[PDB]
């Protein structure tokens, strides 16, 4: 899709293997903010957003949090607290064409900046002058959408680049996109180290009389630590008691 009308893809209710994506050497730029790429195989997230577009090869540095320029300022602005990954690879031999390709357009003129994660497909004529444009091209009334015009023979600074942005929501919620890790039978009344949906800990899992609401998942104490969990496979509630300890 064009950079000014980028599509958004939903990923949920499946198991994803980020190892097969990371090991590929085709990608030229691969930057993950907030999460280490090699550890994505263990965490389980609640939802994945995928965004895809094509930009100029030299100007691929602009798609990053807290950046200023043309596309970031006017077409696609990333949030300042981004927690996700950005992948960008050369696509000269797939999107460029001899004699000029005009299937891709990019916005240039707008009155105000763009809020993060907002897509605009407005086609109104820019009004750079006091006179009304009346939907007629002319003085101070230009078409806001022009094409890049990719060609195979230009330098590195003009080849098209394909960019895909993956974003996760790290909010505590019922998780549905887990990594490929096999489950293990659970043991009660013994000091074990547990991993529930990516959250790790140590302690003893015991039976509980706590009445969670059907939508209610985790319980916390004063110190923000976890106190009771619900097993994802079997809808039971387990209290977590720290292992015995003491000075000698």
């Amino acid at each position, epitope marked *: 899709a064009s950079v000014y009308a980028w599509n958004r893809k939903r990923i949920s209710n499946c198991v994803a293997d980020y190892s097969v994506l990371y090991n590929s050497a085709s990608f030229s730029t691969f930057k993950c903010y907030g999460v280490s790429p090699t550890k994505l195989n263990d965490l389980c997230f609640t939802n994945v957003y995928a965004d895809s577009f094509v930009i100029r090869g030299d100007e691929v540095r602009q798609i990053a949090p807290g950046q200023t320029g043309k596309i970031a300022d006017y077409n696609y602005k990333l949030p300042d607290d981004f927690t996700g990954c950005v992948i960008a690879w*050369n696509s*000269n031999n797939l999107d460029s*064409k*001899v004699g000029g390709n005009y*299937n891709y357009l990019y916005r240039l003129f707008r009155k105000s900046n763009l809020k993060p994660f907002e897509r605009d497909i407005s086609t109104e004529i820019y009004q750079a002058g006091s006179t009304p444009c009346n939907g007629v091209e002319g003085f101070n009334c230009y078409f806001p959408l022009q094409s890049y015009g990719f060609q*195979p*023979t230009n330098g590195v600074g003009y080849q098209p680049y394909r960019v895909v942005v993956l974003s996760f929501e790290l909010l505590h919620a019922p998780a549905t996109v887990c990594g490929p890790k096999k489950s293990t039978n659970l043991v009660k009344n013994k000091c074990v180290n547990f991993n529930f949906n990516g959250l790790t800990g140590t302690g003893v899992l015991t039976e509980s009389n706590k009445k969670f609401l059907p939508f209610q998942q985790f319980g916390r104490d004063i110190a923000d630590t976890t106190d009771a969990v619900r097993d994802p496979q079997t809808l039971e509630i387990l209290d977590i008691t720290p292992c015995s300890f003491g000075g000698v």
Partner: antibody
Amino acid sequence: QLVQSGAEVKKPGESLTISCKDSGNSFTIYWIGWVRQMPGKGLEWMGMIYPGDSGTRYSPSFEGQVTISADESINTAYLQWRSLKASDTAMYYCVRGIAVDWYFDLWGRGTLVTVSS
Amino acid sequence: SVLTQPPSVSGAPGQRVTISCTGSSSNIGAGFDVHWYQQLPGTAPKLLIYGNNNRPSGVPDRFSGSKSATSASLAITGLQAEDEADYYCQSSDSSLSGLYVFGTGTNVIVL
């Protein structure tokens, strides 16, 4: 005009290599590739290579079975077989390919390969 | 994901003939052009129409074609005796699996 080799006959199990040469001075601009046609039926895409950055694309029905390479100095594409089978006898065309619009433009006369046991 | 195509048709010299190539939303949908190719008996083939609206050099003007959403068709006005050949309709696909997919093929008979 793209030149090629002749028609050859070989035993199954050996390795056969065909080559297609382009005389033009615009080799590393467009794509090159291969196509097969089984006698009596229509053709099917095989593989396609961009020599500018050695990009290689294959078809799912013809993955691993065959291998295709190319060189930017001699300006020639090689197609090599692992193990010839009795049912792979067909007519093979080296083809020049254009991008975006995804159509072929002009092809050579092709080559004929026969395998018998 | 091969494209559907009727086996063959017949025609008479001096009259218009028409052929069709039909597919699905995955192949011809989402705005994907269809190109046409020839097959002379025992001869290296040649292009007919690319981009569904343009036309190359060296081809007679008696050929035309257009697409209607899911289907596409071409017309020949005044077929002659040399039109004894095989015709192929080629399109693309959404994924990189179907970059180049061809139809089964169609043939015509004069008189």
